[PDB]
Amino acid sequence: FTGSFMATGKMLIAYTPPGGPLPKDRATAMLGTHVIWDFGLQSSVTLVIPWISNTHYRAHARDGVFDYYTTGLVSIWYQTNYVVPIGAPNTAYIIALAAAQKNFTMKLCKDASDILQTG
Amino acid sequence: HSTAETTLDSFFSRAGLVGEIDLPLKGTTNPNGYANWDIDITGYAQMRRKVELFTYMRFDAEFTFVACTPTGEVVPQLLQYMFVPPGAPKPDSRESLAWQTATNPSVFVKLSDPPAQVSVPFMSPASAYQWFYDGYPTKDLEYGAMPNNMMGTFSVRTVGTSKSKYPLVVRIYMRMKHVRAWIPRPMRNQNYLFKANPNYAGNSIKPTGASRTAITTL
Amino acid sequence: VAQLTIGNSTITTQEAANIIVGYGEWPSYCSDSDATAVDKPTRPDVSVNRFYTLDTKLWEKSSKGWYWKFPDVLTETGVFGQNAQFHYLYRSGFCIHVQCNASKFHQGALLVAVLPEYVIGTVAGGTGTEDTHPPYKQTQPGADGFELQHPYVLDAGIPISQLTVCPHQWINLRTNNCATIIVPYINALPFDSALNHCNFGLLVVPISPLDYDQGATPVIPITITLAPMCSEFAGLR
Amino acid sequence: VAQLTIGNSTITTQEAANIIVGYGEWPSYCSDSDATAVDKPTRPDVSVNRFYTLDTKLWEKSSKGWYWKFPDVLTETGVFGQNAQFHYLYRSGFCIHVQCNASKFHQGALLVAVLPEYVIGTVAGGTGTEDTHPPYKQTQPGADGFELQHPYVLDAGIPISQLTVCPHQWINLRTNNCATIIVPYINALPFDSALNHCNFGLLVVPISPLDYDQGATPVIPITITLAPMCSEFAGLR
Amino acid sequence: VAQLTIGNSTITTQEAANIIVGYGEWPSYCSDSDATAVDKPTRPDVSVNRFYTLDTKLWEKSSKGWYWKFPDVLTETGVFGQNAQFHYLYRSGFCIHVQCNASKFHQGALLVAVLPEYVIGTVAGGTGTEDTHPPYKQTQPGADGFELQHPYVLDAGIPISQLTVCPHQWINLRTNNCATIIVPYINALPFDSALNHCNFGLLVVPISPLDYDQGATPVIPITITLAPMCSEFAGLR
Asked: Which family does it belong to (chain A) (predicted)?
C-alpha cells in the first residue's frame, strides 16, 4: 500500500482455489481463504497461492497447447471504506509484486517469442 | 466494619405480602367460596425491580397465610390451602376432585389457629429461574417467556359443602430463602407497563434521575 | 502489530491490547457425565472455529448504537450456521473483537458490552397502553445487527449508564481503536436451542459522539470480527 | 538517528535501515598477482573516499524518473573526478544512499535500483526506421543525472516491471524515506576506463506517483549521497 | 451372525464370509511429501466414512445385469456427496457389500466385480457406422445404478466371460447370499476430480439366471451397502 501515512482502512484479500468461482460478495469471500489487511497497521501483506499446475494437455483449434485449468483466483475487496483526515489524498495506489516459491519447477524447453532478431 | 446486610440473602430476606384472596358472602368477586392464586413473587411491588438486578436466581420460599374478616375479626372457620404444583390441574369448582387429589399438598387450618406456614422448594426443571429470556419457546407474542419459572398455585377455600357463614380474607406472605443469583444487569429506570415484558412508554422516556439548571450550579 | 490465522481466515491486528474475559471465565467444554452422554455432542474444530468478519457498520455523528444477538449473528453465516440449524442442541463461547479505523483528527468513544439475555422491549404504542411486542427483525437481526432507537434505556427500560456492570470495554478513539471480549457459555441449562434462544447480546454504543472537522472522512468503520470457542452441537437433522 | 563522518563530510541519517549489498558482495580491492603488478595501483583513502552529496532532484506529480551513470556521476566532482580523469585505469565500489523528505501527508513510492551496463536506446525516429543514437548528454549526464522519457521501457526497450531483478530498494513514503545500496565493482575486466565506460546506472523511478493535497509542499526532494568504496587508480597522466 | 456399526449406521450381517481385497491392497491415505502439501487434504472421519445402503435392485428372470460408477454413486448421497462436490480434489477406497435375500427354493448366481475405468460404449447405430456416444445418464447413473443392455460384451465390446480377471466374487444362491469387495484408490494420479472422473465400476451380473417355481417370490432383492475407506478431499469451494 503506497497511500499516505495518515490513511487507514481494511481490505479483504481472498484466494478461491481452482474450480471455485469468484465470490458473489465480500461476505462469501470471507468464508473462504482470506486475509483481512489493515493498511493502517501494516503497509505490505503477502498472499500465498498454494498451488498452480499447468499440466493438463489441450487440443483445441488444431494447435495443441498445455494449459492450466488450475486458475485459482485472487479477489480484493474493500472491508472498510478508505479513511483519511483532512489534507490526505482520497486515492492511494497498491503495487503488487509476485514470484514463485521454492517448490516451483518447469519442464520441456519451448523457445517461443514475438520479439525476434530483425532482418 | 461488617458487611452482612449487603449479602444477597439479607437483601432478599423478609416475608412480604404477595397475595390477597377475597372470599365475600355476597359479591361478583370469587363467587364460589374458592380462589386460585398462581404464585407470583412480584406480588410485593418492590420485588420485581430487585430480583431483576440479576438474570438468574435460585431460592426457596416460606409461605405464611394470615386470615380474618375484612374488619380483622377472628371467626370459627376452617380453611383449606391446597398447593397444586406446576403441571397439576387446578380446581375449577368448589366441588372439583382436585381438592381431593393427594398429590396436591393441602393444609387444613382454623382461622383461630395462628397463621399457617409451609416451605416451597425450587421447582424449576432448569438449574435456575431466570427473569430474562431472549428467545421463543419452541414478530411474536411468545417472546421473552420463560415458562420453567412456574412455582405452583395455591387454591384457597373455606371447608365444607355449604357456603361459609363469614366474609373472609386470606393474605399470603412470602419469605425468600437460600438465595443465589447470577449475571447482574442495569437497574430498571423506566416504569413498568406489563408483568411479562420490559416494554416502556416510548413517549414518556424520563431521565434516570433528577436534573438541574446548569452543570456549574449546585 | 502482527497478523494471526485460524484455518483459512487471517486478520491483521495489534500485538495484544487488554482482553476482557467475561466474568473471569474462559469458554470451556461440557464433560461426559452430562444429561446427553448417549448422543455424544460433536465438538467442531476444523473450519467451524475460525474468524468471521461481519459487514462493517458506519459510525456517524447521528448514530445511536448497534447490537447483535448471539448465536443468531452467525446462524446464517457459513459452516457455523450450518451446524447451528441442523443440530438439535448447542453451547459455545466467543472471542469478540470490535475494531475502528479513524485518523488522529477524529474523536469519539464507543462502549462495547456483552449482555446475557438481552430481551428487547417496545415503546408500547407511545402512551404505554399497547402491549406490543418486538418484531423478529428486531429480536434476532442477523449479521447486520440492529440499531438502537432509544439507547438511554437500551431499548429495554434499563439505564445504559449502568451497562458497565456487564463484561465491557471502551473504544476511545484518542487512545485505542479496538476492544476484545471473551464470552463463556452463559445459560441456566448446559445445552439449548441455537435458533430459538439468543444467549446474549453484543452492544456497541457511542457515549461520546463521533466528531471531526469538515473534510475528514465523515463515517468511521466499526468492524466486528468474531470467533467461536469450544462450541458443541448435538442431535443432527 | 545519528550523524556519521568520513573525512570532512558529515551527513545526518537514521541509525540503520536495511542496506542492500548488490549481489551479496562487498566492494573489495584487487590483489598483487594481477595484470598490472608493475604499475602498482594506488588506492585512494584520505579525501577521495568520502560523502559526496549531489544536487537534490525535485519529485513532482509529473516526474517520470531519473538515472545517473557511474563512475561518470563523480568524474566532474571534486578530488574523485581528479583521479578519474588523470588516471589510465580505474575500479571501485559504491555506497549509494537515496533519501526523501516529505510529510506524513504526502504519498508515493520510488523504486531505487542499480543496473550494470545500462545502455540507453533512442526512439529511433518514432517509426523505428531511423538508426539514431543517444547523445552524450543522455549517455553520460553528469551529476545532475538525466530524466527518463519512457520509464515503462527504461528508455531501452526493457520492462521496468522487472527492474527488481537488479539490486534495488523501495522508498514508500508512508513507511520509509531512504534506501541504501552497496555496489561492488562489476565488469568483465579487473580495471577499465573511468571516462569511457560507465559500469552501471542508478535508477530511481516513481511507481506510485507523488501525491498530496493542495497547500502541501508540491515538490519532494530526492537527495543522493554517495561514497566510493575500495577505489583504485592506475597510470597517472 | 452379528450386527456392526459405524457412526449412526448399523447393518446386520454374517460373522465374516471371505472378503476380497482388490489387487491385494488395502485402501490407504496419501502422505505429506505429496504434490499438494500446502493445501493440507482433510481426511473425513466422523459421518463421512460410514454405511450407505442404496435402493435395493430387484433381480428377475429377465434381468441382464446392473452397474454403478464410483465415486459417482455417492456424489448425490448425503454428507459424502457434500464433500464430493464442494472439493476440488478427491481420492478414496471402498468397502462394497452386495447381499441377496432368497429362499432355499430360489436359484441363481451373480458375478460381482470391480472394473477400474469402466468406459461404456454405444451400439454405434446398429450398423456401427454412427460414432454415437453414451449419455450422461448411462455414463454416470447415480445411486440407482444402470442396467446393462448387452452383458455378453459388458456394453463395451469386451467378454464378460473374462470379467473374473478383475477383483470379483460370486453370489451363488445355493451357497451364499453376499459378496464383499475392498477397493483401493486406483488411478494414474494421486488425486482427481470426484465429479468428472469415475475411477471404477461395480458390476453385478447374473451368469446363472434367477429361477424358482410358481408361487415363490418372483423378484429377489440385491442390496448394495458401501462404505468409504481412507477418503481425502482438497480445495474447498
From this structure: Belongs to the picornaviruses polyprotein family.
* Distance, CA of B136 to CA of B55 (rounded, Å): 17
Does A5 sit within 8 Å of D104, measured CB to CB?
yes
> Do D49 and D6 contact (CB within 8 A), yes or no?
yes
- The technique by which this structure was obtained is X-ray
Helix (H, G, I), strand (E, B) or coil at D217: coil
Side-chain half-sphere exposure of A83, counting CA atoms within 13 A:
25
Amino acid sitting at position C220:
I
Comparing CB atoms, the residue among B55, B132, B143 nearest residue C134 is B143
Q: Which helix (H) or strand (E) holds C130?
A: none
Distance CA C178, CA C157 (A): 28
Q: Look at the block and give the residue holding cell 371447608.
A: B159
Other CB atoms within 10 Å distance of the CB of residue D106 = 25
Residue B125 touches partner C, C-beta closer than 8 Å: no
| CATH number of the domain within which E89 lies | 2.60.120.20
CB contact under 8 A, A7 and D106: no
| Count of pairs with CB atoms under 8 A, one residue in A, one in C | 89
Domain that holds residue B180: 1-218
Is E236 close to A17, i.e. CB distance below 8 A? yes
The C residues from 1 to 30 touching A (CB cutoff 8 Å) are 1, 3, 8-14
Distance from CA of C82 to the nearest CA of E (A): 12
| Total structural domains within chain C | 1
SS3 label, residue D163:
helix
Number of structural domains, chain B? Answer: 1
DSSP string, chain E: -EEEEETTEEEEE-S---EEEGGG-------SSSS-SSS--B---TTTSS-EEPPPEEE-TT---EEEEETGGGSSSHHHHHHHHSEEEEEEEEEEEEEE---TT-EEEEEEEEEET------TTTTS-------HHHHS-GGG-EE-S-GGGTTTTS-GGGGGGSSEEEEETTT-SEEEEEE----SSSSB-TTT---EEEEEEEEEEEE--BTB-S-EEEEEEEEEEEEEEEEE-
- E strands along chain B, which residues? 15-23, 34-38, 54-68, 78-84, 106-110, 116-120, 129-130, 153-158, 168-184
Domain that holds residue D55: 1-237
- Cβ-contact C115, C166 below 8 angstroms: yes
Please state, in angstroms and rounded to a whole number, the distance separating the CA atoms of residues C20 and C94: 12
Q: Report yes or no on chains D and A touching (3+ CB pairs under 8 A).
A: yes
- Name the residue type at position E169: Q
Pick from E47, E92, E46: which is nearest to E73 by CA? E92
Give residues 162 to 181 of C whose Cβ lies within 8 Å of B.
Answer: 162-163, 165-166
C47 contacts on E by Cβ (under 8 Å): 236
Report resolution (Å) to 1 decimal: 2.9
Counting every residue written for chain E, the total comes to: 237
Contacts of C166 in chain B (CB under 8 A): 184-185
Candidate from E35, E38, E235 with C-beta closest to A18: E235
Instruction: Establish if A46 touches chain E: CB-CB under 8 angstroms.
Output: no
Chain A: touching chains (3 or more CB pairs < 8 Å): C, D, E
Contact between residue E67 and residue E148 where contact means Cβ atoms under 8 Å apart: yes
Name the amino acid, one letter, at B128.
A
- Bridge-based pairing of strands E178-183 and E87-100 is antiparallel
Chain C partners within 8 Å of A24 (Cβ): none
Dihedral sign computed on CA atoms, order A52, A54, A57, A61: positive
CATH of residue B154 = 2.60.120.20
The secondary structure of residue A28, as a DSSP letter, is: H
Please report, as a single letter, which amino acid is at residue A27: A
* A1 close contact with D: CB closer than 8 A: yes
Mutate to test the interface with A, among D131, D174, D207 (most CBs of A within 10 A): D174
CB E199 within 8 A of CB E96: no
